[PDB]
Design a protein around this ligand. Structure first.
Ligand SMILES: *[C@@H]1O[C@H](CO)[C@@H](O[C@@H]2O[C@H](CO)[C@@H](O)[C@H](O)[C@H]2NC(C)=O)[C@H](O)[C@H]1NC(C)=O
Ligand SMILES: *[C@@H]1O[C@H](CO)[C@@H](O)[C@H](O)[C@H]1NC(C)=O
Ligand SMILES: *[C@@H]1O[C@H](CO)[C@@H](O)[C@H](O)[C@H]1NC(C)=O
Ligand SMILES: *[C@@H]1O[C@H](CO)[C@@H](O)[C@H](O)[C@H]1NC(C)=O
Ligand SMILES: *[C@@H]1O[C@H](CO)[C@@H](O)[C@H](O)[C@H]1NC(C)=O
Ligand SMILES: *[C@@H]1O[C@H](CO)[C@@H](O)[C@H](O)[C@H]1NC(C)=O
Ligand SMILES: *[C@@H]1O[C@H](CO)[C@@H](O)[C@H](O)[C@H]1NC(C)=O
Ligand SMILES: *[C@@H]1O[C@H](CO)[C@@H](O)[C@H](O)[C@H]1NC(C)=O
Lengths: 49, 113, 287, 79, 99, 44, 49, 49
């Protein structure tokens, strides 16, 4: 999935309170929305526990 | 590179003037003395009859040597020359003005005092 | 998929003259009662320019791959929406990011990708027997596609698929630019009642969408739509009809233009500086 | 920007003093031209000057402004 | 009126040129001094700031010189007008072709 | 000369012949009319 | 930021004047046109007997 | 630095020419008054003509 020409807030991606796990390396998780990037690449697949 | 009429001493290569500009160089091929003169002289000017009077314009060159009239103040193109003299309104220089008279077109003439 | 055409007698392209056309807003600021001059690519006034036909009555159908210079001017006196859209690219062999800006009957579709572009893509409209309405069925614009990153839809645009042979009633002008890879669109629909010799009236062009793609571009080609009625056998070899249309293609050049902003805030005149000595005199005095 | 301007504060002093002198010289120009007399003379109510019509240069009471019809035509002519 | 229009148009165009001078970089990398301060550190962007200072100082000095020459011409014209008032208006002048 | 470096010299609007003509006209007026020609029509 | 009386074309965000100064910016809240006027004018002066 | 030096020299030349033009304007005004008074009539101003 490619995110282009779009406005997106990551605050609603975090207050779900339903994710069993969450890891974010390379940037502090509380200070990523203000930082601006070029392209966002998203890949979705299934995996075991 | 014009043909000069002044000879150099047989040990020089360059030549300057009162204003200290290299305007004379001896040709090494045949020991010929040649002058140097720049080509681009002055700018351009436009003669406009005015708003609500005409639409055509005349272009005047300042110090460039050339319907087309070779005036004493450069080259004037777009305005015919007539030998009679009236009172002039648009000044050009060297005693000749331009105006819009009788259809009707832009003409250039020596001004009347 | 696409099919090949058959050789036939065509007409050579003609050359026409523009009359104060190809003026758009060079920025996105508001200016009122000021004569501001800017250096930007516009269409020079009073210049011979190529003209392309689209009428049937014969069998005129020419779509050359014209080179895309630094900005083009695309004006069409469209009447029955015969033209559909534009495609772009460099080689059109699924090696670069080729644009495809088409206008379908439901929505405008903009997607730059690496489509397998054929020799002459076109839109096919078929006339139904039980239904008395013209419907597009032959969607032959490319063979296939592999991958891309840009796709835009915008608001739906409704057009008429019925083609006639009468006089034109509308005029559409388009300007496509590419500065630092940024794609620019300028358009404004203008009603008119004429067949040729575009009027000397003035009309600015306002931007509609501004695409941040950042790709390469050197060539462009337009797309046309022909009809398949009961008169034609229905094969795209020698029998078809294209209605009546005419589109003009001009190339933009970098010239300084003196714009006339009124108290409302719209451009009224675009006096030049490198066309006429009188225009140069006007734009040097800023009056 | 202000910290580097202390190296050129004298230049700004000369420029400000020159502008002040220009302003006071422009102010003094009006005093030397129009203030020739120190007594304001009133126009007489009698307008019979032997046939000379002076209404085009004398002020008129029809308008709140004290300008003459020539001066009012002069004010609107220039911008 | 030609004499009364030139003294206003010249001042207006001088003010417009003074405004236009701030839109130039004078050989620097930006026109507005806030942009270089926001994008570069003050220890490194000192030379661009100083170049802008020199350019603005030169433009202001040229404007001051032009205004001083214009003020001198206005002073001469005002002296002429005052003499014309005191001679032709406040009496009758015997100078031929002066009033 | 002084014109080789773009320092062009503009010719005057009135030539020396026209200035001489003006001076001769003023001379003729001041010997044939005195001051009448300078303040109205010329009187012999 | 005063309330202006001049409307803007629906594609512009900035606005300049004859002297080329940005003095009218459209507020993106509910499309209000607001003028810009500097608050500091001139200097001070003293009257001394 | 060549641009700045040539600009400074040109500006100094223009200032000198403007001062010379002002002096020439004053001299021409004096000459015009002399032509209007001593030539186009008889001037009663003593030690002027
Ligand atoms: C002095 O001149 C003025 C001209 O402005 C005269 O005013 C005009 O008089 C006529 C005659 O009645 C009117 O038709 C005009 O409308 C007047 N014009 C204006 C501007 O008032 C005035 O009558 C003259 N006075 C004398 C005593 O001669
Ligand atoms: C201008 O050029 C022509 C031909 O080159 C020449 O005959 C003429 O003398 C030139 N004019 C002057 C003033 O030298
Ligand atoms: C003007 O008249 C004179 C009279 O002899 C003649 O020599 C000259 O050629 C004329 N010029 C034109 C342009 O007719
Ligand atoms: C090309 O332009 C010129 C000048 O505008 C014009 O005279 C000429 O007819 C044009 N060419 C064609 C084929 O019309
Ligand atoms: C064109 O694309 C739109 C979606 O952008 C779609 O709704 C429409 O059906 C398409 N037209 C055809 C003829 O497939
Ligand atoms: C699409 O695939 C091609 C391989 O043919 C590759 O070169 C190109 O980088 C891909 N595009 C993107 C956006 O990944
Ligand atoms: C774009 O095309 C030009 C030649 O038309 C080429 O020199 C340049 O490298 C190309 N750039 C890209 C990013 O493909
Ligand atoms: C622009 O706005 C002004 C002021 O409201 C109005 O008088 C004028 O008619 C408008 N122009 C157009 C073309 O609507």
């Amino acid at each position: 999935k490619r995110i282009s020409n779009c406005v997106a807030d990551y605050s609603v991606l975090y207050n779900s309170a339903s994710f069993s796990t969450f890891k974010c390396y390379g940037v502090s998780p509380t200070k990523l929305n203000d930082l601006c990037f070029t392209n966002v690449y998203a890949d979705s697949f299934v995996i075991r526990g | 590179l014009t043909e000069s009429n002044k000879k150099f001493l047989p040990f020089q290569q360059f030549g300057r003037d009162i204003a200290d500009t290299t305007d004379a160089v001896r040709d090494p091929q045949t020991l010929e003395i040649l002058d140097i003169t720049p080509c681009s002289f002055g700018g351009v000017s436009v003669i406009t009859p005015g708003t609500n009077t005409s639409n055509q314009v005349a272009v005047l060159y300042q110090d460039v040597n050339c319907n087309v009239f070779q005036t004493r103040a450069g080259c004037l193109i777009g305005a015919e020359h007539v030998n009679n003299s009236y009172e002039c309104d648009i000044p050009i220089g060297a005693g000749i003005c331009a105006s819009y008279q009788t259809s009707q077109s832009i003409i250039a003439y020596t001004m009347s005092l | 998929q696409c099919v090949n055409l058959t050789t036939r007698t065509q007409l050579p392209p003609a050359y026409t003259n523009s009359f104060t056309r190809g003026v758009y807003y060079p920025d996105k600021v508001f200016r009122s009662s000021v004569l501001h001059s800017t250096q930007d690519l516009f269409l020079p006034f009073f210049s011979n320019v190529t003209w392309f036909h689209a009428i049937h009555v014969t069998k005129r159908f020419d779509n050359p791959v014209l080179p895309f210079n630094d900005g083009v001017y695309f004006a069409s006196t469209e009447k029955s929406n015969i033209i559909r859209g534009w495609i772009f690219g460099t080689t059109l062999d699924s090696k670069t990011q080729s644009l495809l800006i088409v206008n379908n009957a439901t929505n405008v579709v903009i997607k730059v990708c690496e489509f397998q572009f054929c020799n002459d893509p076109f839109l096919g409209v078929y006339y139904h027997k039980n239904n008395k309405s013209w419907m597009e069925s032959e969607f032959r614009v490319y063979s296939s596609a592999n991958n891309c990153t840009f796709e835009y839809v915008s608001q739906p645009f409704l057009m008429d698929l019925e083609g006639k042979q009468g006089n034109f009633k509308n005029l559409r002008e388009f300007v496509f630019k590419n500065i630092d890879g940024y794609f620019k669109i300028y358009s404004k629909h203008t009603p008119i009642n004429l067949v040729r010799d575009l009027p000397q009236g003035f009309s600015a062009l306002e931007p509609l969408v501004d695409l941040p793609i950042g790709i390469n571009i050197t060539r462009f080609q337009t797309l046309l739509a022909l009809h398949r009625s009961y008169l034609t056998p229905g094969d795209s070899s020698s029998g078809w009809t294209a209605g009546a249309a005419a589109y003009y293609v001009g190339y933009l050049q970098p010239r300084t233009f003196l714009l006339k902003y009124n108290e409302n805030g719209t451009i009224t005149d675009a006096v030049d500086c490198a066309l006429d000595p009188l225009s140069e005199t006007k734009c040097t005095l800023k009056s | 920007c202000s910290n580097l301007l202390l190296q050129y504060g004298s230049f700004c002093t000369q420029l400000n003093r020159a502008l002040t002198g220009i302003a006071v010289e422009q102010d003094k120009n009006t005093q030397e031209v129009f203030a020739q007399v120190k007594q304001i003379y009133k126009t007489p109510p009698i307008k019979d000057f032997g046939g000379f019509n002076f209404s085009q240069i004398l002020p008129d009471p029809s308008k709140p402004s004290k300008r003459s019809p020539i001066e009012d035509l002069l004010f609107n002519k220039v911008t | 009126l030609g004499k009364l229009q030139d003294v206003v148009n010249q001042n207006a165009q001088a003010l417009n040129t003074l405004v236009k001078q701030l839109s130039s970089n004078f050989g620097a990398i930006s026109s507005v001094l806030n942009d270089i301060l926001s994008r570069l550190d003050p220890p490194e962007a000192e030379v661009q700031i100083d170049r802008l200072i020199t350019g603005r100082l030169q433009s202001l000095q040229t404007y001051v010189t032009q205004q001083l020459i214009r003020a001198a011409e206005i002073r001469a014209s005002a002296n002429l007008a005052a003499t014309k008032m005191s001679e032709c208006v406040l009496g009758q002048s015997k100078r031929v072709d002066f009033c | 000369a002084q014109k080789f470096n773009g320092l062009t010299v503009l010719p005057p609007l009135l030539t020396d012949e026209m200035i001489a003509q003006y001076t001769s006209a003023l001379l003729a007026g001041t010997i044939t009319s005195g001051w009448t020609f300078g303040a109205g029509p010329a009187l012999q």
